[PDB]
Structure formats: structure tokens, C-alpha cells
Amino acid sequence: GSKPYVVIDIETDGLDEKKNTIIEIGAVKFNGQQVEEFNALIKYEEKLPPTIFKLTGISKSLLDQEGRDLKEVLSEFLLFIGDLTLVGYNIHFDIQFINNKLNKFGLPLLINKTHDIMRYVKDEKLFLDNYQLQTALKSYGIEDSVPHRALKDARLIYHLSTKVNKFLARMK
Ligand SMILES: [Mg+2]
Ligand SMILES: [Mg+2]
């Protein structure tokens, strides 16, 4: 069957890998036998743009109450993923942020192989109006609204990955 792989997803407070930061990190690992999950909200000392609240529902209060230290979370994330293939949707966004913060804290950077589900979708679904994750999901019969929360989005990307035949063939 499938080789092991880990679907990753983050939420951030902006688009700049070097000035903005990670507010949530989620992952769905198929370990070769079954599925495991990773999720952490990140403690945050800056002024969270209310735009972040409207998209994700994450507020300062949530990060204050449930957030964990970013360096600690990233160390645990490295242990969760090991050297497994990483999978995502426009995955360079997640990797750019994760590597920037790993580097900032003096932690090892990612050297994992990667596959981007978005690339497979663009080649299989040529007539989509756009290639946002939400649009891709519907094209494959997944009607869930995208919540813009890291683990919840990772679950949706994982479900998508089990429906993209070209990806499945590559991972056999
Ligand atoms: Mg995302
Ligand atoms: Mg997300």
C-alpha cells in the first residue's frame, strides 16, 4: 500500500515568512499502518490583526489560553515528522514559514521530500475557476467549508490526497 507521509498545514498572522509568525501548526501523519495527528496553537505576544480573527476565528484570548511556546512546538513537530515525506497544498508557504522559524531558534531545518497536492489538482482538474483549496475540494466531491484552522485544514488536505490518483500512484 501507501508509503508513509505527513500532511502539514499552518496558520500565520501574515504572509511574510521573515516578519510574520506562526499561530497554529497541524499535521496528519499516515505512519504506514494508521493515522496520527499533531496540533498546537502558538503563544503570541504581538497585536493579532482582526483580519486573522475573521478568517480563522483565532483571537489573542485563544492563543493566551491554549498557545504553547513556538520553539518547544517546533521541536515536537520535528520529532513527529522525522524524515517522512511531507505533503501539503501550496506547500512552499508552510515550508518557508517553518524553516524560517526553525532557523531563528537554532533548530534543524527540513530536508524532507515533499509533494504538493495542488500541483496534482492543477493537472487533473483543468477547468476549475481557481485553485484555492476550497475550489479543489469541491471538484473532488468534498463539500466541507475550509475553516482556516491548521489541523482541520490538514485533515481536508489529507482526505483530498486519498482521491488524487496521480499522487496515489507516486506514493505506492
Ligand atoms: Mg493554510
Ligand atoms: Mg490552514
Report how far ligand 2's centroid is from the alpha carbon of 37 (Å). Answer: 15
Phi/psi for 142 (5° steps) reads -105, 110
What does each C-alpha distance from 76 to 24, 70, 91, 104, 107 come to in angstroms?
13, 10, 20, 16, 11
Q: How far apart are CA 94 and CA 67, in angstroms?
A: 19
Cα of 28 to ligand 2 centre, how many Å?
13
Distance 13 CA to ligand 2 centre (A): 12
Whole-number Å distance, alpha carbon 150 to ligand 1 midpoint, is 7
Q: 3-class SS at 108?
A: coil
Domains in the chain: how many in total? 1
Experimental method: X-ray
Structural resolution in Å: 1.5
CA–centroid distance, residue 14 to ligand 1 (Å): 11
Distance 137 CA to ligand 1 centre (A): 14
Burial bucket for residue 141 (CB in 10 Å: 0-12, 13-18, 19+): exposed
42: domain CATH number?
3.30.420.10
Ligand 1 center to residue 6 CA distance, Å? 15
Q: How far apart (Å, rounded) are the C-alpha atoms in residues 119 and 144?
A: 21
3-state secondary structure of 124: helix
Q: What is the span of the domain harbouring residue 165?
A: 5-171
